[PDB]
Paper text:
The HIV-1 viral spike is composed of three copies of the gp120 envelope glycoprotein attached non-covalently to three copies of the gp41 transmembrane molecule. Binding of the primary cell surface receptor, CD4, to the gp120 component of the viral spike exposes and/or induces the formation of a site for co-receptor binding (either CCR5 or CXCR4). The NBD chemotype consists of three essential regions: Region I, a para-substituted aromatic ring; Region II, an oxalamide linker; and Region III, a tetramethylpiperidine heterocyclic ring system. Herein, we present the high-resolution structures of NBD-557 in complex with clades BYU2 and in complex with clade A/E93TH057 gp120 core, as well the structures of four Region III NBD-congeners, AS-II-37, AS-I-261, MAE-II-167, and MAE-II-188, in complex with the clade A/E93TH057 gp120 coree.
Numbering used by the authors:
A (entry chain L): 2 to 212
B (entry chain G): 90 to 124, 198 to 301, 324 to 396, 412 to 457, 463 to 492
C (entry chain H): 1 to 219
The structure:
Amino acid sequence: IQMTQSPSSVSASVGDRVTITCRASQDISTWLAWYQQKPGKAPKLLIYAASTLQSGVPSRFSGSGSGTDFSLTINSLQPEDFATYYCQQANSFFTFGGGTKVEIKRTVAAPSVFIFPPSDEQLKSGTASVVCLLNNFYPREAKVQWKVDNALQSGNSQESVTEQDSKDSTYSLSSTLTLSKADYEKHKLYACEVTHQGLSSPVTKSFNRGE
Amino acid sequence: TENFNMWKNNMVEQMHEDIISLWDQSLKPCVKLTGGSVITQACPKVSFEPIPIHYCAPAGFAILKCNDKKFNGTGPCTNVSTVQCTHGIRPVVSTQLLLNGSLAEEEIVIRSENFTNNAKTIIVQLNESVVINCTRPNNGDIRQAHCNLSKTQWENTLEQIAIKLKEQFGNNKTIIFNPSSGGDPEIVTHSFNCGGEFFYCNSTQLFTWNDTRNITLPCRIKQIINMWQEVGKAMYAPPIRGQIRCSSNITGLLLTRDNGTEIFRPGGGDMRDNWRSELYKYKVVKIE
Amino acid sequence: EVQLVQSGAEVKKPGATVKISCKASGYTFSDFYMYWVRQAPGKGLEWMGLIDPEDADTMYAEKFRGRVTITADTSTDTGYLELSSLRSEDTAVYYCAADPWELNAFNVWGQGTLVSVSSASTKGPSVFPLAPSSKSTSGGTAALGCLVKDYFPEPVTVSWNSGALTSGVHTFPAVLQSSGLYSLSSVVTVPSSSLGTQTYICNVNHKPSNTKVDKKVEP
Ligand SMILES: CC1(C)CC(NC(=O)C(=O)Nc2ccc(Br)cc2)CC(C)(C)N1
Ligand SMILES: *[C@@H]1O[C@H](CO)[C@@H](O)[C@H](O)[C@H]1NC(C)=O
Ligand SMILES: *[C@@H]1O[C@H](CO)[C@@H](O)[C@H](O)[C@H]1NC(C)=O
Ligand SMILES: *[C@@H]1O[C@H](CO)[C@@H](O)[C@H](O)[C@H]1NC(C)=O
Ligand SMILES: *[C@@H]1O[C@H](CO)[C@@H](O)[C@H](O)[C@H]1NC(C)=O
Ligand SMILES: *[C@@H]1O[C@H](CO)[C@@H](O)[C@H](O)[C@H]1NC(C)=O
Ligand SMILES: *[C@@H]1O[C@H](CO)[C@@H](O)[C@H](O)[C@H]1NC(C)=O
Ligand SMILES: *[C@@H]1O[C@H](CO)[C@@H](O)[C@H](O)[C@H]1NC(C)=O
């Protein structure tokens, strides 16, 4: 009743052969189905019975396995094959796997760091949000820290990363620091140091409140 | 000249535990729900092909057989015979209708532990079987099925049975048959296992008869069933795509009585009664 | 011909009960299984349970086994899902699936139903300018955008210059604050030598509250 899907993430280039696996805690014979999902779109069935292909689905998709061990493979990787795939139990219950994301592999790219001070319109409302932007970088892994007056703070900030772009195949991260009007006025130096694989040393973009 | 008894019989409980152990070896559920516990396991697709089972007596014991043409199953038998093993009994798990059973020697014989009691199940034994074909269309719907039998032949059966009923409950009475009032799908419909699949056939045309060519029964295949071995639910694997056919003989029925008139409805549920209809002439006794 | 139409999105309080419906068409509704699956934003697919309408046989996942209920009205050909004791963790898009061709897989899917659970009431967002500056310019490029803060529930659409500007436009997914309110940001990279001539306006839209806002970003 438990499905393990590995790896969790895989990066490849166009025209490559991708292969993902799927493990079942209990013997479920040949009752496994594979799905394809894209951000915003509903899941589309690809392979059922752990081998039989769906009518309309490209022939470059093939599956195999039986019992507890399965696997999905693609003959050639097309530009529309990049997505998330799931394996599903289908003997009695229909438990899904963790899923696996297929991302595009490219050369390392250094993030363009920019910082935006709180607007006058927000300060009038009673709050103050600082935004740190990391534009176009790779891989997706990156660290962003907030330091107020050289003091590392945590618990008062959140971030979000955009999906992999299609033109340059990079990512962009947005980190927002939110404090009240009073708290924000009790300090002067606001900075967000960034550590990335494409950066030799931690880059820091800062500004003094009232500049 | 000893006393026989089919209701307190020990052999019935003997094979009941045997059939249970048989289903655990061939027809294993994929999900089992019993006593607030969720159990999951392997669920292989094994076809269920019944085979005549001969029950013999252990070392230091013997099986006595009663040879009475009209023995109600309770009382002293004058024609007692000593045998080694019983006749080939085909372990057919079902409800309402008894399949592939043994027929009556002379005429129909209705048996009951207590006719006066409406709670006690009534076991009917025919002296002539009525063939019923339950097939499943080949590769519409995979869970859809149907059964066919002779309408006229089934009419006579009901008529002959109704005669035996009044012959026991008094002549001046009206015998009417009505479908099950309610209950689980297995009880309300004629349920049975064929080709490893569980069939649930609608039995409204068979049990809607009044004193004053063929019959097609619409059936369905389920995966979630109410276990007969014990209390709880079980979920089996998806049905096979191949053709499923099973021609069997109706050799008996299970009736249950409850507008001042005699109304009889299809019974079943306790598979013990199914074994009784075959072991009503046998009993195990220890050799002295 | 064969499609599953679900009910519109809803909003519930932590502790209330929600009930979703799914109308089927193009096949014998009472002769096939109906499945339910939910997906939390950022996470993967999660099976909840199934049902055999004609007899009302159900099977629930171990997680929801205790506060979930699946039914199927064969009179109107509509399946229902009910989850009680709702929490902030139950926020996700719920789907009702089926298998008309009997392949033992979810071949057909509904459009989905977003169920937002939070102690926060429905509220329109507040748009804040992200003015360009020497702290956001790289050589010949400049960085600007808009900040949509404190809104509920989702979703929110954002365009620049009425869809006129698309190049270098990045819109980030929203983030759920501890207050139970959402907040997201959208930025754009443009030539620095065009900041004092070209006008930049972001367009924010919030349907759940009927809130449209057009903000002009200036240095
Ligand atoms: C005594 C009583 C009332 C009988 C009930 N019987 C059944 O559920 C039953 O016979 N089910 C069944 C299952 C498969 C087939 Br094929 C045919 C029939 C079950 C228990 C729990 C023993 N209670
Ligand atoms: C069966 O026969 C015995 C012995 O003659 C008798 O006592 C009993 O009433 C009979 N049972 C029925 C149900 O006819
Ligand atoms: C079966 O019972 C009927 C009466 O119900 C009887 O006429 C017939 O002789 C019995 N068996 C035969 C020979 O058909
Ligand atoms: C059968 O039921 C009747 C009516 O309740 C009762 O009087 C009689 O004693 C019962 N016979 C038995 C249990 O042997
Ligand atoms: C199946 O049932 C029919 C009556 O419905 C019967 O004529 C036939 O003999 C049975 N099986 C065979 C051998 O075709
Ligand atoms: C059995 O068939 C009759 C006649 O078509 C129908 O009215 C009834 O609903 C059926 N019973 C079940 C349980 O499907
Ligand atoms: C009854 O017995 C016949 C003959 O052996 C067999 O073909 C048929 O499958 C049996 N019926 C059932 C329901 O097992
Ligand atoms: C029904 O099948 C049995 C074997 O399962 C067979 O012995 C019997 O003759 C058949 N009934 C009749 C008389 O058609």
